[PDB]
DNA sequence: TCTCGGGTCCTAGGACCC
DNA sequence: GGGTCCTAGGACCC
């Protein structure tokens, strides 16, 4: 009842499609992001600039104090997307059993595979190869019995690397693995998770899992079971998206409801514009809005609505506008729709 | 350094249905 | 009293 899971992860995925289309990129720091005077963050960076600590999620302005030869894209989302097309296409070649999780990632389910004498392991070193040749990109991968230690697999020969974990390994593997490292743990709960004294997986095991209910509920379930090695999760193929959503930061933290309305209506077209691509005639199930001010609490009004409607988008931002500022300022505004169920 | 924009899934109270 | 819808927010991931 064992099966074969792969995943494949491109390696510092937005920079190195940079680098590969312009190779004076290759040796010097650079980093996909928003300017810091458009107070902007770091989507990704390449190793040269990882060196000097830039990660994804830092804020731009601590990346140049960190780095201050950095350069900085905007990035250019046609050529990631025709990219992850591609590889997606080559994933197609060797199964069907496909769950993409974003441009550059995904899984393949491989077991009843018979494409490298059915090893899970040569069918990944031939996928890594085939996107180096045909893409100039490298990818690294993780081979494991479910989903989740296929995932933590990948990264830890990356570079242009892979990992396989078997059967056999796996209990040794999980007795040191942090739970931090577990997808759907992240800082808020691996610091909860700490304060009881549970910082591995191996510490879990040693727990009742009625206790992990009580103190965490479903998430808890997903603890134990995740410590055990148990993950059940089937590669999907059929997920489809369920929102759409435009939001925009702006340089200046905002005060005034002329500004925001101006800001709306440079939105909208933004927003109808990417609905009609998946939904022409622009038929939804909900629309709503979204503040984040001066001091980030953040805030959303959203209801049951049939089309996309900009005035209703409007009204709503002002109401929101009017009952929850309270005089702070605002530093982004955003419009989001919530799409039809089947 | 001062904190994005695209999403996913889980929770939870009161409404509403039976 | 027991489902399921409706809304808002939070944690998380890429
Ligand atoms: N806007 C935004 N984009 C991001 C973020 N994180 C990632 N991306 C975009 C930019 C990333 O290029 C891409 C894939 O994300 P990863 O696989 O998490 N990291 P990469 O592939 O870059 O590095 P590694 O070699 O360690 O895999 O998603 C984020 O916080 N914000
Ligand atoms: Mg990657
Ligand atoms: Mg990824």
């Known amino acids: 009842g064992s099966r074969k899971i ?77 990219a992850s097309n ?12 496909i769950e993409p999780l974003s441009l550059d990632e995904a899984y393949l389910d491989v077991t009843d595979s018979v494409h490298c004498h059915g ?17 100039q990109l490298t990818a690294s991968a ?4 479910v989903k989740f230690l296929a995932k933590i697999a990948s990264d830890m020969n990356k570079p242009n690397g892979q990992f396989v974990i078997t059967p056999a390994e796996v209990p040794a593997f999980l007795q040191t693995l ?20 549970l910082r591995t997986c191996g510490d879990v095991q040693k727990c009742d899992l009625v206790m992990l ?33 435009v939001e925009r930061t702006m340089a200046e933290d905002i005060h005034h409801w002329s500004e925001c309305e101006a800001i ?8 109808e514009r990417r609905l009609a691509k998946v939904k022409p005639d622009l038929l939804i199930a909900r629309q709503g809005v979204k503040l984040k001010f001066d001091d980030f609490q953040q805030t959303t009004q959203e209801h049951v609505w049939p089309r996309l409607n900009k005035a209703d988008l409007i009204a709503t931002a002002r109401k929101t506008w009017d009952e929850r500022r309270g005089g702070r300022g ?13």
């Open 6 to 82: 792969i995943h494949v992860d491109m390696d510092c995925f937005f920079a190195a499609v940079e680098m590969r289309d312009n190779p004076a990129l290759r040796d010097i720091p650079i980093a996909i992001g928003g300017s810091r005077e458009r107070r902007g963050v770091i989507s990704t960076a390449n190793y040269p600039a990882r060196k000097f600590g830039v990660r994804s999620a830092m804020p731009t302005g601590m990346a140049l104090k960190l780095c201050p030869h950095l350069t900085l894209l905007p990035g250019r989302f046609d050529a990631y997307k025709e």
């Open 86 to 97: 591609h590889i997606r296409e080559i994933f197609s070649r060797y199964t069907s059993r």
């Open 119 to 135: 090893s899970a392991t040569l069918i990944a070193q031939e996928i890594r190869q085939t996107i180096f040749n045909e893409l």
């Open 142 to 145: 993780g081979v494991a019995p």
């Open 178 to 197: 942090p739970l931090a490292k577990i997808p759907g743990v992240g800082k808020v709960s691996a610091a909860k998770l700490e304060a009881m004294g």
């Open 213 to 245: 209910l009580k103190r965490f509920g479903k998430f808890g379930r997903i603890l134990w079971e995740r410590s055990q090695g148990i993950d059940e999760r089937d590669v999907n193929s059929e997920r489809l998206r369920k929102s759409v959503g």
């Open 264 to 271: 709306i209506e440079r939105l909208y077209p933004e927003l």
């Open 330 to 342: 605002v530093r982004l505004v955003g419009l989001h729709v919530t799409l039809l169920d089947p």
